[PDB]
């Protein structure tokens, strides 16, 4: 079995827009150079989350049919997915992108940034569970698009229009599981398992913000 030309096209548009992302050299130099203090560590995470929201908006705009949605619905989707997309992208970087010694330095900074262990422990557990699935770049891209195009977010006016965009992405993802892992029929179910685990970070993050150093304009505005 294979993807239809229509599904191959949809996948290519998602993949091209996903691979455009890159961690700015400036931020990576800060991870290496900045002093090891709670204040400097917190600011590094702030710069990382601000960069991600910009990267997230650019990726979202390129999602097939996203631009054809009502303008208010476009904003409500961005707002509702911001936190989940952040944790998913942070899981990818942890299990891939950052070097062995460089990721050890970033982990040291996260564990000394003023974030309570009540929030650090489910975060690193999620990173490990994601790592266990050995997700392909196609799976990370499609899962991010599925998270963004969630028809059950608050304040969407035309939910059916969003469903029409998300259903083909779930179809493609399930087909890619059947093609690339035919011996593991529960692979798609495990991917859905990370989606529900992602939803819990909405409450973990909202509680974390309620505990309190301030925010960036993209942060407490997309985070409410």
């Amino acid at each position: 079995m294979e993807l239809t030309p229509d599904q191959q096209t949809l996948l290519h548009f998602i993949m091209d827009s996903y691979n455009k992302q890159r961690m700015p050299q400036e931020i990576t130099n800060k991870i290496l150079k900045e002093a090891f203090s709670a204040e400097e560590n917190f600011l590094i995470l702030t710069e990382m989350a601000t960069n991600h929201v910009q990267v997230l908006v650019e990726f979202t705009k390129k999602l097939p049919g996203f631009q054809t949605l009502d303008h208010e619905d476009q904003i409500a989707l961005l707002k509702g997915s911001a936190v989940e997309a952040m944790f998913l992208r942070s899981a990818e970087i942890f299990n891939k992108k950052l070097p062995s010694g460089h990721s050890d330095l970033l982990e040291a900074r996260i564990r000394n940034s003023g974030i309570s262990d009540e929030y650090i422990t489910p975060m690193f557990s999620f990173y490990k569970s994601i790592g266990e699935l050995k997700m392909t770049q196609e799976e990370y891209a499609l899962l991010t698009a599925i998270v963004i195009l969630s028809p059950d977010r608050q304040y969407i006016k035309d939910r059916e229009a969003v469903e029409k965009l998300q259903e083909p992405l779930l179809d493609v993802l399930q087909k890619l599981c059947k093609i690339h892992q035919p011996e593991n029929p529960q692979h798609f179910a495990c991917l859905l398992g990370r989606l529900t685990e992602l939803r819990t970070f909405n409450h973990h993050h909202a509680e974390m913000l309620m505990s309190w150093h301030k925010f960036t304009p993209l942060l407490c505005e997309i985070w409410d």
Binding site: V53, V57, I75, K79, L218, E221
Partner: peptide, 12 residues
């Protein structure tokens, strides 16, 4: 409200 998200969304 959402002035930065709106700006980023609508540019180009």
């Amino acid at each position: 409200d959402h002035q930065l998200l709106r700006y980023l969304l609508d540019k180009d």
